[PDB]
Amino acid sequence: LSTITTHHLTVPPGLTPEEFQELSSSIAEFHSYRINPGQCSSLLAQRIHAPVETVWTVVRRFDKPQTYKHFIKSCSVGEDFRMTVGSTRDVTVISGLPAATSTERLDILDDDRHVTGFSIIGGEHRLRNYRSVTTVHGFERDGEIWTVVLESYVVDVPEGNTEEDTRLFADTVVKLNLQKLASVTETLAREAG
Amino acid sequence: LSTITTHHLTVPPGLTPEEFQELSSSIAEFHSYRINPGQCSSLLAQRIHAPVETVWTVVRRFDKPQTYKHFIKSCSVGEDFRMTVGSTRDVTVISGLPAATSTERLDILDDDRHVTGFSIIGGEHRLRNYRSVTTVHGFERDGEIWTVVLESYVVDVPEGNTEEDTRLFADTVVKLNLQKLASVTETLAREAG
């Protein structure tokens, strides 16, 4: 039958137990999925030495994912684009396969709570029915500030793939992109503006 | 007909004109290929704030490419392995496709000149007949030291791929792995040993 993900019940890679205790309710609220056989789901975390709003300024830009994500040749949103839920983008993917475009829909965008997410709704690639949520969270300790970004997804496991290799793949990509996010926004922080 | 690559005649991404002028002869010697229609070739560079021998200690470890390369699930060399030209490794690749192993042969290993290279000799993936060379080079300016790593390859362009997308893919992967090499060996340098 279907089941609920348990991301909110264990400490994910990249997070401390202290940070987890502060985020458990957010993980439950935004990073929970009902998951069916044949799907995989994961939660990744990344610490960033930058203020929450600096990081959020990059995370929220649905029209420019290539600012922090790897393997993007181009991203188009057309002309009428406004940052509203329901908007779509066409991402041309860099892969060893022939050309492929991923069409992606903006599912969530909450600037007050720092939540966004999207769904892959078409394209010929290996993350069919992918859906993902990213949240941004601030931390402080004796005047020092930092941010944690949480990114979770659910996706279908292709016929002939094992669950483990689909999850390893998607996890590897998400982890690399959060590392890029960390570099980009830490640079932005060092420089001000 | 066949032609020679011109990597040694222009400044590659990631290198300064001053650094190029010092390396042009090495690019000619080690990063030249005779290339046929249907193949692509590229030269990438990466500056590393670490001594040449620190970087070389990681670059030369043919049995542990996952120390600096991305998307490696495992790498096996068996039991009799000695670091000699002709040895092979089986690299299990992380991809969105079903399981695949790349069998790779060590083509060059010169510890005096800091040159190594390998050939993909089998496996079902999209870099057929890939062959690559990596060289490591030291620089100094008023007591400050740094290293440049050059990595070139030639590879077949799969039927139905464009040249541009094969090169974009292989370039993206090589560039990410050299960035990882830079982080790993800069950390090793900061810590000594």
Ligand SMILES: COc1cc(/C=C/C(=O)N[C@@H](Cc2ccccc2)C(=O)O)ccc1O
């Ligand atoms: C970069 O952004 C995105 C990336 C992806 C990539 C998915 C995928 O399956 N990629 C495969 C290559 C591949 C295989 C077969 C058909 C097409 C592509 C891989 O890399 O192994 C999806 C949405 C995105 O927004």
Ligand SMILES: COc1cc(/C=C/C(=O)N[C@@H](Cc2ccccc2)C(=O)O)ccc1O
């Ligand atoms: C990580 O190390 C290596 C990586 C590669 C990857 C090659 C390749 O074509 N990868 C594809 C995915 C893919 C597609 C179809 C069949 C198998 C795989 C991609 O990612 O789009 C080769 C040698 C290596 O040593």
